[PDB]
Amino acid sequence: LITEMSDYDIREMIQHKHVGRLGYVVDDRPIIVPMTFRFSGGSFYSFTTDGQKTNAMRKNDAICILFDQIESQTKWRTVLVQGRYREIAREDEEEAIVRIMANEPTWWKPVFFRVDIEKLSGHQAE
């Protein structure tokens, strides 16, 4: 049985699950890469030192992030964020860095970016 996750459980997942899997499109083909994200002010913040990822997402800014907690084949939770790559300007990197780090529970030339949310969905199976 697959049901919709409550907003509370979606929120717990996207506040507390550091690692997400980022999807982007190159030449009409999907690529997935694990990244660590911080949800702050309704967007997800991250960075990459991989110029190929940066370039890909500049040319096609339609991206997603999967967060999931998979216990078994029949016990799992998934949250999909669909949105847009928005690259952080040099002038705004210190803001991005503080948003990323400020009051995080866990312990920790990049190009910083955020993911603005166009659709957020969450489901679970018990």
Q: What angle do CA 33, 116, 92 make, to 5 degrees?
A: 95
CA distance 81 to 22: 9
- Which alpha helices (DSSP H) does the chain contain, by range? 7-16, 51-59, 93-101
Identified binder of its own copies from the candidate list 33, 89, 98, 101, rule CB under 8 A: 33
Q: Which of residues 72-111 bind its own copies (CB under 8 A)?
A: 73, 76, 78, 80, 82, 108
Residue from 10, 13, 22, 35 that binds Cl ion (CB under 5 A)?
Answer: 35
Stretch that binds Cl ion, among 11-19, 34-42, 49-57, 74-82 (CB under 5 A): 34-42
| Least distance (Å) between residue 24 CB and Cl ion | 14
Establish if 78 lies at the interface with Cl ion (CB under 5 A): no
Q: Is 87 helix (H, G, I), strand (E, B) or coil?
A: strand
- Cβ neighbours of residue 90 under 8 Å, at least 6 residues apart? none
Per-residue CA distances from 61 to 3, 85, 87, 113 (Å): 30, 5, 10, 11
Q: Is 36 in the site for Cl ion (CB under 5 A)?
A: yes
- Taking the complex as a whole, the smallest distance from the CB of residue 113 to Cl ion amounts, in Å, to 9
Stretch that binds Cl ion, among 7-15, 25-33, 91-99, 103-111 (CB under 5 A): 91-99
**Footprint of Cl ion (CB under 5 A):** 35-36, 92
